[PDB]
Amino acid sequence: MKIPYGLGAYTRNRGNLPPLELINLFVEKSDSQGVILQSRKALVEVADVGAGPVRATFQKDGVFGGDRFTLSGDEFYRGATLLGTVAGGGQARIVSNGLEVLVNAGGLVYSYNGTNFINAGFPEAAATTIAFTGRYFIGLSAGTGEWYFSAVNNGRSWDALDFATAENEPDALLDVLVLDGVLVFFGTESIEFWGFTGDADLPYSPIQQRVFEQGIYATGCAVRVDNSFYWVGKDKIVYRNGDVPQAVSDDGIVEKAEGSTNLTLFVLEDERHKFVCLRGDDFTHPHDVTTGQWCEFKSYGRTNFRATADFGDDETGKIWAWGGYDDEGIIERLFMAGAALEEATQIDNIRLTCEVGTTPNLVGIYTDPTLEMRFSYDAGNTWEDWEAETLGAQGKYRQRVEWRALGMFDDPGALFQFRITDPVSFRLSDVQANAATGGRQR
Amino acid sequence: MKIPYGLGAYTRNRGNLPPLELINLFVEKSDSQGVILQSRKALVEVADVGAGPVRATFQKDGVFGGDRFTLSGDEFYRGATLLGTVAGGGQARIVSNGLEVLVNAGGLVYSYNGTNFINAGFPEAAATTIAFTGRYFIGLSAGTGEWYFSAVNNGRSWDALDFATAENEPDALLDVLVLDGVLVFFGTESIEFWGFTGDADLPYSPIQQRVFEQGIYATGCAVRVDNSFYWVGKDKIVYRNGDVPQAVSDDGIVEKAEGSTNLTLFVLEDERHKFVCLRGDDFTHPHDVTTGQWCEFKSYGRTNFRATADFGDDETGKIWAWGGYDDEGIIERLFMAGAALEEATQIDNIRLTCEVGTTPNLVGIYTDPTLEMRFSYDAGNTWEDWEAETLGAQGKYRQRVEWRALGMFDDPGALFQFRITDPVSFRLSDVQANAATGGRQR
Amino acid sequence: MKIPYGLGAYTRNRGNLPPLELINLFVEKSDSQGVILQSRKALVEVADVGAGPVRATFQKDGVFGGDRFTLSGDEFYRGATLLGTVAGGGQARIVSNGLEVLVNAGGLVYSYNGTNFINAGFPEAAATTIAFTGRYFIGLSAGTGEWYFSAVNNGRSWDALDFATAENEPDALLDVLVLDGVLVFFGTESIEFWGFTGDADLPYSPIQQRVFEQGIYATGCAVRVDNSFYWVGKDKIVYRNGDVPQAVSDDGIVEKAEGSTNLTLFVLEDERHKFVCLRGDDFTHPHDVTTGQWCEFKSYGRTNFRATADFGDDETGKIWAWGGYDDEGIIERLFMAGAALEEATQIDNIRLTCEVGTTPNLVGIYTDPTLEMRFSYDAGNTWEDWEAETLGAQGKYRQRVEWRALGMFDDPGALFQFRITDPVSFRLSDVQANAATGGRQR
Amino acid sequence: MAAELHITPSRATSSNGLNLDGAKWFFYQTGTTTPQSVYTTAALSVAHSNPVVADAAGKFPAIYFDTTLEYRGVLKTADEATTIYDIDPINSGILSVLGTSS
Amino acid sequence: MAAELHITPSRATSSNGLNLDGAKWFFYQTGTTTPQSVYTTAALSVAHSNPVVADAAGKFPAIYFDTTLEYRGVLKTADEATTIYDIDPINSGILSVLGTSS
Amino acid sequence: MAAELHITPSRATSSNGLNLDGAKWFFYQTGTTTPQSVYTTAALSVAHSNPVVADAAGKFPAIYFDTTLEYRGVLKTADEATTIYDIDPINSGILSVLGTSS
């Protein structure tokens, strides 16, 4: 037959629901097989800077030849040169138009040019965010404030009379985003839209009847994923822009986001897989955007998958990319397959259709990966011992992975759990409950 | 029965997926048969110019009587006359309104008239592209720049004060395209739209809220296929214009485009088959536009199917068209047919319904084309020996092509592979797994 | 049973595809029977003028009492009066508002009034087309040109300063069409739209973002069929106006249009059947517009079905209409019925449900029409002898037309072919493969 | 300066231990099943037939390739059946590989 | 321009004239007895198992090396005994020898 | 970067299927019938005898050439008769061909 294996990371603890979940495995389509589970690529080391938690990084091709701008700890690094220091704050941001590279924290705005790095001179003390690059530079004043704007392509000279107040949020302002020629201002209470005017004194004007009522949660909770954007909202429900804002988070992501009092959003780029990660206290649930299914990234030996607004680390000052396998030591990959059964059965067999015997190792302990499975009764509230089967050496492309002496299942549903914790790449297409016995040397 | 043969070129190497693919065969509809595979026409020799890699060609009917303008190597050829030289650059382009023929590289703009060929006098040194013909001539300045425009129908006299800056991309500009009366400017970061004003000082004006966020990859990655156009994007995902930009590339085209650091796009014209080729380091995947299925063109004995922005060669200075057969020596044509099987079977037969015995040869070695097939186990990771059957001589329209002693298939799926490498035209409608034996002399 | 007989004229010679086709038979709906094939009416003689190929004709009811204006050979005929001569050219056109009748060729514009016929005085030498009648007269200058306009309702007095240039096609202009108050100008490269202004100096203005990229093929390739219009395009794919231009030609019409270097379009009026004929070197494929299916009109003993932009002949100077039967001598009518078979069968019978025994002849050789059918093997690449059955005399409304000793069909499909070449009207509703034997004197 | 290794040539033998006679190597192009020529001497002048034959004990004669173009060979018996070997690049390209890459 | 010589491949046979089945080539590193990979295709993509097996008559499949690194091979029977051949540089270095010397 | 093909070495067998013992390869100069040396190791240091012998089953030892100079080999039985093979350029010149031409 064919047992329905779970495609999402659904663990709800309101009731004692059966926790079908994915670990380091996401869903995509194919053409030879129908629906497939694929592995997560291991992490590498690309660029190393001075130690400390990396907060925000930046590099392009048309600015300064491609020099890597980072904010590690409390101070810059342009390559390995020190370039002064930054005041302390909450969330960082790097803005540039090619002739000058700005930076931010909760405290101050620091500009840069060919050889100097001093204060840009924001028209008051504090600042929240800076967004825009191509024509102006737009800053957000902390507290009950407005947004200021500089001169054309000149972030080193601000002005006090160049501002524009908002008229719908009395509490604060937290984030700003450039979606089109228009602007998007995130309040703590409402969301406004401000189009481009084309004047000299005031260059922007509001759109009248476009106000969303779900204000942003914090200062780092808005990502331009696509032609439109995402945010988090005053409550922990990740939304999506449209005619009306629709919601993409369901149960089991919403009730888990309350325990973390810190929530961020960022993208991770894969080849046509734009993940949208929701980083919290320990979890990291990336919402895939092409086939929209929640999954779970978890790095080994730690409390959370290490990442930030880019591929930087949260510790020791490291930046990487995706590449290869066998670099992070152990990559755990776990999936679920259940029956929702009602009558007493005789499960004589269980079967996987994975990729078989393509490990590149011949010396060492990883010449046979040996995944292992685990029975359960009573909807996964208690478990049984592991049963491990090998995956074969290299070149043995014909090796069935099966278990043959399972027994009886008197349950509201038989519920299995598979795991491989090993640097070998892993694939899965289908499972089979009961099959027959034919063969020619396999 | 009827075995599902593959309609696309799906070879993904993330997992060890079964690689069903087409070689020199594309899919179209019909009315007598349902769905058909058809061959690729052989290449000819039409016009020959001086040697070197042909970069860009041009001919029409309402300009200069139809004289073939080409850029072979480092210098022009108008027919066989030399017409000066061109500076070195990245991607070429030929623009004309009938009274003057421009050209470009990465370096300079060279105009032409009845008898002279000298510098057009771009208002600064470098240039990226020229597009427009009918009213103005529009040039793109290299670096962090804008676009300049000439006088009406006068490409030989530019001006320094005739420009218009952009306001959304700070990095660069790479490509320009004339879709309608409007213009389309491809930045490295965003895509803008600029309509036609009708003034004298500034003749173009922007459209406010139409900004796409996927900037072009390079300078040669935008093709006006249809009423709308295509591009490649900052990542390797070929898009398509609409209300929102949708994507047309899937897995197995995206992960293969990373290995090539050079990507182009062009059209090949067939009778109601507008192919859109993605040329890379070795591959050429043409996206058909009427029945949108990826396939693969591969010329023999080489590393890539030889073509450019038109039917010119990448070597020795040759230009052709489509015509006939038996010109390129050997044309390989390969397709796949698989079962996705689960139980042990007895495949006693396999059958093709092709076109049979219509070769025009009577002398020589090609009087019997003799295609050949190949078994596989273990999802195509290893293969078996060929089994060849003839196709019959000319006039024998009744010849079944079958194999009769196959055996047992204990697999996740039986998976076959057929090939004919021969100048005879080839057709395929259906296959049959198991059939019966009737007949009257066939 | 019921064998699917073909409804279109599908003959593709890319592969050696089974050529199901219609000859002088088109498809319409009904209510008593479901789907029916009906005959083509014979041609008559209505008006005869001086000899030569008729190029363009014209008559109405509100101009000059209804006098037939024709251009036979090189000179007019108003009835049988000579009315001067015309210069030589490519495609003719007759334009009138009631007080004056214009004409054209590739060369000159000739006006007319109550008693005089002299030169209208186009503001330069050559002209391509004239369209508009009710307010102005609009002419198209040959070469790289624009369109001129005359005074109000005065085609005999043009002016040199009355013109308006185009801004998107640099090559040429070929055709013009009045669809609404707006105008449609066909370039060799693009298609423009020009609305009505209401001024005195310049009376027309362009629509900004409506540009089609498929320019017309020649000067006679645009027909106002309906509320919208058709054209042919730079390649041989007949299109159709809409939001975006969709295509109506498929394979087997496109690959046949390349062999003819001359392509025209016109309408033939039937009672609620507006045919759109594509005339070429030998073919004439009329696209029906209500039930859109391609068919084929072929006159006997010749190389092409004789017609032009109206019902005029291409030779000897004749004009007709539709009427009756038994006028053109022999009308061939041919249709196809195939099985797409896979297993060896025993076809013991074959059956038609036609109209039976309604011939009006009692003397002569046509008292029994006697259609005949023809076997085939090997997808129609070779055939067999005819088997003829009579249709019965007049008044015998009960006569089955069947063949009883067919035999075995070991094929990729049994494939039959029927033909009647006889002035009797012909109908077909259904066919039957195997039937039973009941009856009372029939 | 470098050591070239020697391999003793074999005979055309069947699935059993017995020797075969009249075995035929068919030499082709790269992957196309179109016949190419095979030369008999140290130089590249005299080409013998493309279906070669062996002796009564299964001795093939001296077989030399042209290293600027690829090859493909099979084995058949006298009745044109029971394909023994099939090797798709049966030649090792010395000049044709170094001339296109490396 | 140059003539490449052809050698017909043999079977795995014992000390007598009989053929062996299940014979195993063990391919190693240069002199270290550490297992390396051996590829099955014209390219260097798909690597089959390092202990290879033959057919019931002693047919080994298509065996291709990587010429930028040395090899060493042996033969054993099914019972892992009676070492038939042992050749220490069993590969002939085309690129790996010209890249270090000459 | 390039694929080197493998050929299993054969034994010294007669016209029948039986194996021969004491078979002798005589290695010569290019075409002159003058004896040259044949080395036994991976390097080019220790040269064994030019008339080589096989085992009781027909196993020849590891035979290595010197690629800067041509060779020519034959086969004989123990009684110095019944010449089995004779190949005039039995070596494939890697360095000696590229050093004079190409």
Side-chain angles (χ1 to χ4, degrees), chain C residues 351-370:
Chain C
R351 181 65 54 82
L352 297 179
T353 61
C354 63
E355 66 180 1
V356 172
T358 60
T359 177
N361 293 321
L362 287 83
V363 293
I365 59 171
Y366 292 156
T367 186
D368 285 326
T370 70

Short mmCIF file of all heavy atoms in Angstrom, two decimals, chain C residues 351-370:
data_model
loop_
_atom_site.label_atom_id
_atom_site.label_comp_id
_atom_site.label_asym_id
_atom_site.label_seq_id
_atom_site.Cartn_x
_atom_site.Cartn_y
_atom_site.Cartn_z
N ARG C 351 -20.95 1.42 -42.89
CA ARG C 351 -22.28 1.98 -43.09
C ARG C 351 -22.19 3.50 -43.14
O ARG C 351 -21.37 4.10 -42.44
CB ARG C 351 -23.20 1.52 -41.96
CG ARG C 351 -24.62 2.00 -42.04
CD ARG C 351 -25.30 1.43 -43.26
NE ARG C 351 -25.19 -0.02 -43.28
CZ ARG C 351 -25.98 -0.85 -42.61
NH1 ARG C 351 -26.96 -0.37 -41.85
NH2 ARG C 351 -25.78 -2.15 -42.71
N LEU C 352 -23.02 4.11 -43.98
CA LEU C 352 -23.20 5.55 -44.00
C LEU C 352 -24.65 5.88 -43.67
O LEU C 352 -25.56 5.09 -43.95
CB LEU C 352 -22.83 6.16 -45.36
CG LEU C 352 -21.39 6.04 -45.86
CD1 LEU C 352 -21.23 6.67 -47.24
CD2 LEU C 352 -20.42 6.65 -44.89
N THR C 353 -24.87 7.04 -43.06
CA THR C 353 -26.21 7.59 -42.88
C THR C 353 -26.21 8.94 -43.59
O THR C 353 -25.99 9.98 -42.98
CB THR C 353 -26.61 7.74 -41.42
OG1 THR C 353 -25.70 8.63 -40.76
CG2 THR C 353 -26.59 6.39 -40.71
N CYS C 354 -26.47 8.90 -44.89
CA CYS C 354 -26.45 10.06 -45.76
C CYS C 354 -27.87 10.43 -46.14
O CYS C 354 -28.84 9.86 -45.64
CB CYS C 354 -25.59 9.77 -46.99
SG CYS C 354 -26.22 8.43 -48.02
N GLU C 355 -28.01 11.40 -47.03
CA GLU C 355 -29.29 11.64 -47.67
C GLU C 355 -29.36 10.80 -48.94
O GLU C 355 -28.38 10.66 -49.67
CB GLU C 355 -29.54 13.12 -47.96
CG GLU C 355 -28.65 13.79 -48.98
CD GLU C 355 -29.02 15.24 -49.17
OE1 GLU C 355 -29.96 15.71 -48.48
OE2 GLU C 355 -28.39 15.93 -49.99
N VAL C 356 -30.52 10.20 -49.17
CA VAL C 356 -30.63 9.04 -50.04
C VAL C 356 -31.72 9.29 -51.07
O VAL C 356 -32.87 9.53 -50.72
CB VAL C 356 -30.95 7.76 -49.24
CG1 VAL C 356 -31.25 6.62 -50.17
CG2 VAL C 356 -29.78 7.39 -48.34
N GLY C 357 -31.34 9.23 -52.35
CA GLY C 357 -32.30 9.15 -53.43
C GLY C 357 -33.12 10.39 -53.67
O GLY C 357 -34.33 10.30 -53.91
N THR C 358 -32.50 11.57 -53.59
CA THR C 358 -33.19 12.82 -53.84
C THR C 358 -32.65 13.55 -55.05
O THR C 358 -32.72 14.78 -55.12
CB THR C 358 -33.12 13.72 -52.60
OG1 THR C 358 -31.76 14.00 -52.30
CG2 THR C 358 -33.77 13.02 -51.42
N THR C 359 -32.09 12.82 -56.01
CA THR C 359 -31.61 13.44 -57.23
C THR C 359 -32.79 13.88 -58.10
O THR C 359 -33.82 13.21 -58.15
CB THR C 359 -30.70 12.48 -58.00
OG1 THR C 359 -30.30 13.07 -59.24
CG2 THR C 359 -31.36 11.13 -58.25
N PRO C 360 -32.70 15.04 -58.75
CA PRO C 360 -33.79 15.51 -59.61
C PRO C 360 -33.69 15.07 -61.06
O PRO C 360 -34.45 15.57 -61.89
CB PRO C 360 -33.65 17.03 -59.51
CG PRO C 360 -32.20 17.23 -59.36
CD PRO C 360 -31.69 16.09 -58.53
N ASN C 361 -32.78 14.16 -61.39
CA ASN C 361 -32.50 13.78 -62.76
C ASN C 361 -33.24 12.51 -63.12
O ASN C 361 -33.30 11.57 -62.33
CB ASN C 361 -31.00 13.59 -62.97
CG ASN C 361 -30.23 14.87 -62.85
OD1 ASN C 361 -30.68 15.92 -63.29
ND2 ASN C 361 -29.06 14.80 -62.24
N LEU C 362 -33.79 12.48 -64.32
CA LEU C 362 -34.45 11.28 -64.82
C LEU C 362 -33.92 10.87 -66.18
O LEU C 362 -33.95 9.68 -66.51
CB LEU C 362 -35.97 11.49 -64.90
CG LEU C 362 -36.79 11.53 -63.60
CD1 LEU C 362 -36.77 12.89 -62.93
CD2 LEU C 362 -38.21 11.08 -63.83
N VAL C 363 -33.46 11.82 -66.97
CA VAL C 363 -32.72 11.55 -68.19
C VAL C 363 -31.26 11.88 -67.94
O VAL C 363 -30.91 12.65 -67.05
CB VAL C 363 -33.27 12.35 -69.39
CG1 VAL C 363 -34.66 11.87 -69.74
CG2 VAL C 363 -33.31 13.83 -69.05
N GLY C 364 -30.38 11.27 -68.74
CA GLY C 364 -28.96 11.51 -68.60
C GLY C 364 -28.29 10.44 -67.77
O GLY C 364 -28.89 9.46 -67.32
N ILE C 365 -26.99 10.67 -67.55
CA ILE C 365 -26.15 9.69 -66.86
C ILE C 365 -26.11 9.88 -65.35
O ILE C 365 -25.51 9.06 -64.65
CB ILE C 365 -24.71 9.76 -67.40
CG1 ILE C 365 -24.14 11.17 -67.19
CG2 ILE C 365 -24.67 9.38 -68.86
CD1 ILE C 365 -22.67 11.28 -67.48
N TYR C 366 -26.74 10.93 -64.82
CA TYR C 366 -26.69 11.23 -63.40
C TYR C 366 -27.95 10.78 -62.66
O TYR C 366 -28.34 11.41 -61.67
CB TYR C 366 -26.45 12.72 -63.18
CG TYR C 366 -25.08 13.19 -63.60
CD1 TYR C 366 -24.87 14.52 -63.93
CD2 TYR C 366 -24.02 12.31 -63.71
CE1 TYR C 366 -23.62 14.97 -64.33
CE2 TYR C 366 -22.77 12.75 -64.11
CZ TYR C 366 -22.58 14.08 -64.42
OH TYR C 366 -21.35 14.52 -64.82
N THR C 367 -28.59 9.71 -63.13
CA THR C 367 -29.78 9.22 -62.44
C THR C 367 -29.45 8.38 -61.22
O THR C 367 -30.34 8.15 -60.39
CB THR C 367 -30.67 8.43 -63.40
OG1 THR C 367 -31.89 8.09 -62.75
CG2 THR C 367 -29.98 7.16 -63.85
N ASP C 368 -28.21 7.92 -61.09
CA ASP C 368 -27.69 7.20 -59.93
C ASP C 368 -26.29 7.72 -59.64
O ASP C 368 -25.37 7.50 -60.44
CB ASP C 368 -27.67 5.69 -60.18
CG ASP C 368 -29.05 5.07 -60.13
OD1 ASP C 368 -29.89 5.54 -59.33
OD2 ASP C 368 -29.32 4.11 -60.88
N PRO C 369 -26.09 8.42 -58.52
CA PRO C 369 -24.81 9.13 -58.31
C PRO C 369 -23.60 8.23 -58.08
O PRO C 369 -22.52 8.56 -58.58
CB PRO C 369 -25.10 10.01 -57.09
CG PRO C 369 -26.57 10.18 -57.10
CD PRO C 369 -27.12 8.89 -57.59
N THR C 370 -23.76 7.13 -57.34
CA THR C 370 -22.77 6.05 -57.18
C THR C 370 -21.44 6.55 -56.60
O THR C 370 -20.42 6.62 -57.29
CB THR C 370 -22.52 5.30 -58.50
OG1 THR C 370 -21.82 6.14 -59.42
CG2 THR C 370 -23.82 4.84 -59.12
#
